Amino acid sequence: RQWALEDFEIGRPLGKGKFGNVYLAREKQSKFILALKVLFKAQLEKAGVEHQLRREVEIQSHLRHPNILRLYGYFHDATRVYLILEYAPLGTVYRELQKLSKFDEQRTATYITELANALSYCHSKRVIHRDIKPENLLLGSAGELKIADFGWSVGTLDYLPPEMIEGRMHDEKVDLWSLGVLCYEFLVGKPPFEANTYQETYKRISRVEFTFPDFVTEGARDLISRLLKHNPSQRPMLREVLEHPWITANSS
Numbered sequence: 001r002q003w004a005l006e007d008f009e010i011g012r013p014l015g016k017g018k019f020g021n022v023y024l025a026r027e028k029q030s031k032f033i034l035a036l037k038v039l040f041k042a043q044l045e046k047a048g049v050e051h052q053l054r055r056e057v058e059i060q061s062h063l064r065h066p067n068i069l070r071l072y073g074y075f076h077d078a079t080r081v082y083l084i085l086e087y088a089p090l091g092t093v094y095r096e097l098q099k100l101s102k103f104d105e106q107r108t109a110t111y112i113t114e115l116a117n118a119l120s121y122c123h124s125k126r127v128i129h130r131d132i133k134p135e136n137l138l139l140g141s142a143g144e145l146k147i148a149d150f151g152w153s154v155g156t157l158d159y160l161p162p163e164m165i166e167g168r169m170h171d172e173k174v175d176l177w178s179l180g181v182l183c184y185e186f187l188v189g190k191p192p193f194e195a196n197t198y199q200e201t202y203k204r205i206s207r208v209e210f211t212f213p214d215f216v217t218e219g220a221r222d223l224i225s226r227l228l229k230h231n232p233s234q235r236p237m238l239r240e241v242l243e244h245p246w247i248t249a250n251s252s
């Protein structure tokens, strides 16, 4: 289908930054509510990285999973490019983590399970999302977790694996790492490697240096230690993750 800007009525801005902005949009002749991520070619030619975007569009267009934000279609005028995305009713995991300060183990273990199912789906298609962080985690009408953008899929350091930040070439286990980083943050409120400088964060991720606050339970600490280790090969498969005792005992 061929789209134009004059097919959508533009509404409330949901998010800013990254040389583009998303507005809550309702299409006119069927009243469909969707999110319209609007990037500008001027700022994108200066970035000069349509490369992964055209791929990300292709990546996300035919990805059909209930825990992945569906991308409907693309179109553009001269100066800007529109990505027509599914609308997430309940917002981001980021702001909700911001408000609750921390998640109790049930909301956390549930969030992990949904991520794994979405990743096991992406891993079934040899897709690696790389940039998994709370900012691109969204919530559906039922409040289900939904993975968002794949612009950096096939910088900001905190969720990137040791092998990835150093130069050795990734594999799909880099999401197992990111999963481990997410689980920690959900329970603590902060990333395991969060630092004050890039050069310093880089070291902590490289030496794998993190410590558990005293309120994080034993079963929790176990799963995080298995996911967040230097050697990718001995990291669990998403199967082993879902069937983790602590995951099973708290997920729903």
Ligand SMILES: Cc1cc(Cn2cc(-c3c(Cl)cnc4nc(-c5cn(C)nc5C)[nH]c34)cn2)no1
Pocket: 014, 015, 016, 017, 018, 019, 020, 021, 022, 035, 037, 038, 085, 086, 087, 088, 089, 090, 091, 092, 138, 148
């Ligand atoms: C460029 C660029 C990236 C972003 C990040 N961003 C994504 C959203 C977003 C998307 Cl893609 C889809 N559905 C959303 N629903 C919300 C939302 C709902 N509530 C109640 N509050 C918010 C926020 N955000 C969505 C927003 N930002 N922005 O520009």
